[PDB]
Amino acid sequence: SGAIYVGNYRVVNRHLATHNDWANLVWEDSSRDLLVSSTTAQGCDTIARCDCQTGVYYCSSRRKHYPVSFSKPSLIFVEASEYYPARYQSHLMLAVGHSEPGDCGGILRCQHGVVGIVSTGGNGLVGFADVRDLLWLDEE
Numbered sequence: 056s057g058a059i060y061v062g063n064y065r066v067v068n069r070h071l072a073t074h075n076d077w078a079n080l081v082w083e084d085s086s087r088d089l090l091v092s093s094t095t096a097q098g099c100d101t102i103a104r105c106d107c108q109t110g111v112y113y114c115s116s117r118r119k120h121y122p123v124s125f126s127k128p129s130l131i132f133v134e135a136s137e138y139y140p141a142r143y144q145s146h147l148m149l150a151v152g153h154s155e156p157g158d159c160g161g162i163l164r165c166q167h168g169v170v171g172i173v174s175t176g177g178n179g180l181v182g183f184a185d186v187r188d189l190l191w192l193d194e195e
């Protein structure tokens with residue numbers, strides 16, 4: 056579990072969005088595993104605006120943050136998980152590391168701020184849904 060809290064936006068994995076998220080929906084994309092909802096209180100996070108390929112992510116199933124190198128966001132085939140069938144996922148970055156389903160929502164961060172959230176795992180990789188292209192998160 057986990058979210059990004061930027062301005063008056065909550066960014067969550069689409070598959071973990073609540074009824075309240077859907078009732079306060081700003082934007083969602085199943086192909087990216089992302090959903091954004093509106094918040095009453097302003098959030099503490101800053102979105103990275105960069106093309107870094109190194110950062111640190113939080114792994115809940117280890118209670119640990121790991122430094123990783125990761126691929127640039129791409130359209131990637133993802134094998135079946137507990138929460139999605141085998142399918143193509145867009146705007147996905149991969150790193151070598153541990154990820155189980157409950158790790159989804161952990162933040163990946165670089166020197167510029169939040170890069171994305173854990174979205175995929177298995178076979179010794181962790182996949183992250185990028186948010187750095189979502190420039191509208193920074194205003195309004």
Ligand SMILES: COCc1nnc(N)s1
Pocket residue numbers: 079080081082083
């Ligand atoms: C296509 O759906 C976008 C949205 N729907 N309700 C909102 N409040 S934003």
Ligand SMILES: [Zn+2]
Pocket residue numbers: 103104105106107165166167168
């Ligand atoms: Zn960066």
